[PDB]
Design an enzyme around this catalytic site. Structure first.
Site, PDB file in Angstrom:
ATOM      1  N   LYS B 112      -2.988  -5.101  14.051  1.00 12.97           N
ATOM      2  CA  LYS B 112      -2.788  -4.298  14.188  1.00 12.97           C
ATOM      3  C   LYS B 112      -2.111  -3.969  15.728  1.00 12.97           C
ATOM      4  O   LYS B 112      -0.588  -2.870  15.684  1.00 12.97           O
ATOM      5  CB  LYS B 112      -3.071  -2.899  13.863  1.00 12.97           C
ATOM      6  CG  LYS B 112      -3.802  -2.762  12.233  1.00 12.97           C
ATOM      7  CD  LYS B 112      -2.253  -1.973  11.493  1.00 12.97           C
ATOM      8  CE  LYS B 112      -2.672  -2.344   9.602  1.00 12.97           C
ATOM      9  NZ  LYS B 112      -1.947  -1.844   9.097  1.00 12.97           N
ATOM     10  N   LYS B 194      -2.440 -12.388   3.833  1.00 14.11           N
ATOM     11  CA  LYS B 194      -2.884 -11.722   2.754  1.00 14.11           C
ATOM     12  C   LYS B 194      -2.386  -9.991   1.986  1.00 14.11           C
ATOM     13  O   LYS B 194      -1.104  -9.694   3.369  1.00 14.11           O
ATOM     14  CB  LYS B 194      -4.420 -10.218   3.787  1.00 14.11           C
ATOM     15  CG  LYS B 194      -4.219  -8.262   2.781  1.00 14.11           C
ATOM     16  CD  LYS B 194      -5.156  -7.800   3.853  1.00 14.11           C
ATOM     17  CE  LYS B 194      -5.581  -6.707   3.606  1.00 14.11           C
ATOM     18  NZ  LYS B 194      -4.525  -5.795   3.350  1.00 14.11           N
ATOM     19  N   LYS B 197       0.085  -3.682   1.883  1.00 14.56           N
ATOM     20  CA  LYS B 197       0.893  -2.417   1.785  1.00 14.56           C
ATOM     21  C   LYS B 197       1.990  -2.096   2.363  1.00 14.56           C
ATOM     22  O   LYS B 197       2.815  -0.995   2.151  1.00 14.56           O
ATOM     23  CB  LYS B 197       0.038  -1.020   1.396  1.00 14.56           C
ATOM     24  CG  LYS B 197      -0.393  -0.826   2.020  1.00 14.56           C
ATOM     25  CD  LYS B 197      -1.047   0.897   2.276  1.00 14.56           C
ATOM     26  CE  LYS B 197      -2.408   0.968   3.391  1.00 14.56           C
ATOM     27  NZ  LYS B 197      -1.319   1.922   3.839  1.00 14.56           N
TER      28      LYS B 197
END
Ligand SMILES: Nc1ncnc2c1ncn2[C@@H]1O[C@H](COP(=O)(O)OC(=O)[C@@H](N)Cc2c[nH]c3ccccc23)[C@@H](O)[C@H]1O
Ligand SMILES: N[C@@H](Cc1c[nH]c2ccccc12)C(=O)O
Lengths: 324, 333
Positions: B112, B194, B197
């Site tokens: 992140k 991965k 979202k």
């Protein structure tokens, strides 16, 4: 009135420096400002310590602040952990604080509370629409961060927070360490012989004042000179702060007197001050019903203001409002 | 009393088939067997900078999605994280029993941070501690999550044990419940990555509220491999895209990989993708049908949040009271 916020460490053991300087100053300005005193037990646990001693220390600090003259009818005094909004806003403000800012605060084994407490401190201040914060030099970086967080959050969402200022004018009383009169008397000292605590008995005060550093002037002369006679000057300053007598008045009073008489009068004056303070302290501290009611009333006042700010913060961020 | 299940999902981005397979599927199946508590973690969501209108809408979207998946408010506690102050309270307290090195080593913080270099905030760093607080508040036994949250949960276990070692049996030590299939659903145009979202490339993702027709087209364009002849076989290293498609099919239908491999003998990627498309498109149609009934019923969503926050507060306050007594705070009157 302007709102003033102060955070009082539970583990702290206050000295005559703390009292005669900042605290006594602030006791006399409780009708001038809306003063808030937060006993910061959530900040305290960033250092690991005995649980039973922390509970004791919280109540010791409460009674001592009350004994010094903090009036719970005029000022708001409360325990930090009793108002959930501090932790709540603490988390919210984490998300608007750079990791970089906390790393630059003046390695892997440090706990996250010690790393993150400047944000909780920012929340403590900003919760109450605080105008003024009396800080020492070592807490100035933390105040600046709280000002930076407030401006940053305000620029995104509008004027939610007041931007706090430092309380600039300094006490008046100068209290230096007894064996190192160049260094200021501080509760954090490891050499306890440098300080006189507020709960010290008259025998302990005599012992520490007798040992206090003076100078090798011949004849010994009781005159004010911080550069050349730091120790004697400190004893004069301490005595002046206690009695209200001016320095040139004391210099005249001790004309033709050795340092033995000065030390005797200093010890007598300080213990005269500490006895009335201790009387009040032990009376408040042993009354658990009184302390409980002060904490309850204080937390109720604090929560009223704290919840209004947090509501505006939560509305600004966009959280779905709680269903009460 | 039953053992306690706790889990949460962020009201940020738009929840995907990955989020469903790794977490929500298991949440629905556990409701009778265990005492289940599910959370919309809006306080975690703001560690990535959200628009205020988008956050509010997404919180209510996520709530409605739980209900659409089959999360029954009569069986499970469903609440918004910010409505229960104890999460932030225990969140702070647990910072003092969490090491800096544990948080800096986190994969999610590093991923992140590289992505949002303009907002590497303290919330993003402190993410695991609040997550630990979320779990430990409810005496949680099981935590159903995807594989990517394994590291975070491992720290929650360490914090719980470390705290218990000093103060006694204050917390339950939680266990992961990561599914056999669909624990880490991968991106359709990048099967080594991965499924996110909040992906910049929408063609990587199968959104749970996305038009089924658009999802069928995305499955058809999912990258496979150059094998000649094409063979439907599980091999993550050499056939990442085909393996991800088999994983998705397995998780939706309940059929094992060897069962599907046998079923696709003599077939190629057209059959595979046809089956994946049919199974996923059918699932999303039903889900979205229920969703709009729930999502447009504000009175019902308001009642679920009220009842859920009340139930959660009862558990949370009990734990925080014990935590506060143990560390040595003066108890609130
Ligand atoms: N591609 C994927 N394939 C399979 N599973 C996936 C995929 N992407 C995500 N997941 C899983 O979905 C759940 C929600 O993820 P969030 O990012 O909303 O949210 C998260 O990643 C949590 N930190 C939210 C949280 C906060 N507090 C908690 C306490 C307990 C459990 C969970 C939480 C997660 O279980 C995640 O593992
Ligand atoms: N950090 C301060 C105590 C404190 C906590 N929050 C505060 C807010 C304002 C002033 C002081 C404080 C100290 O260590 O001494």
């Amino acid at each position: 009135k302007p709102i003033v916020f102060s955070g009082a460490q539970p583990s702290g053991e206050l000295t005559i420096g703390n009292y005669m300087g900042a605290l006594r100053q602030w006791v006399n300005m409780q009708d001038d400002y809306h003063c808030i005193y937060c006993i910061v037990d959530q900040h305290a646990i960033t250092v690991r310590q005995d649980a039973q001693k922390l509970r004791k220390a919280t109540l010791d600090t409460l009674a001592l602040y009350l004994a010094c003259g903090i009036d719970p009818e005029k000022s708001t005094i409360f325990v930090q952990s009793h108002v959930p909004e501090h932790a709540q806003l603490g988390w919210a403000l984490n998300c608007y604080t750079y990791f970089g800012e906390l790393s630059r605060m003046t390695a892997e084994n440090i706990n996250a509370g010690l790393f993150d407490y400047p944000v909780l401190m920012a929340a403590d201040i900003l919760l109450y629409q605080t105008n003024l914060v009396p800080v020492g030099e070592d807490q100035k970086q933390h105040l600046e961060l709280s000002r930076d967080i407030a401006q940053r959050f305000n620029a995104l969402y509008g004027e939610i927070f007041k931007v706090p200022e430092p309380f600039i004018p300094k006490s008046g009383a100068r209290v230096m360490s007894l064996l190192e009169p160049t260094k200021k008397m501080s509760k954090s000292d490891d050499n306890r012989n440098n300080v006189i605590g507020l709960l010290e008995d008259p025998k302990s005060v005599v012992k520490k004042i007798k040992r206090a550093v003076t100078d090798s002037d011949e004849p010994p002369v009781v005159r004010y000179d911080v550069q050349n006679k730091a120790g004697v000057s400190n004893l004069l300053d301490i005595l002046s702060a206690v009695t209200g007598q001016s320095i040139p008045e004391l210099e005249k009073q001790f004309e033709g007197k050795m340092y033995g008489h000065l030390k005797g009068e200093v010890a007598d004056a300080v213990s005269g001050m500490l006895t009335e303070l201790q009387e009040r302290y032990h009376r408040f501290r042993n009354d658990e019903a009184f302390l409980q009611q002060v904490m309850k009333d204080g937390a109720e006042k604090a929560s009223a203001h704290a919840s209004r700010t947090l509501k505006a913060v939560y509305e600004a961020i966009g959280f779905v409002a709680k269903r009460h």
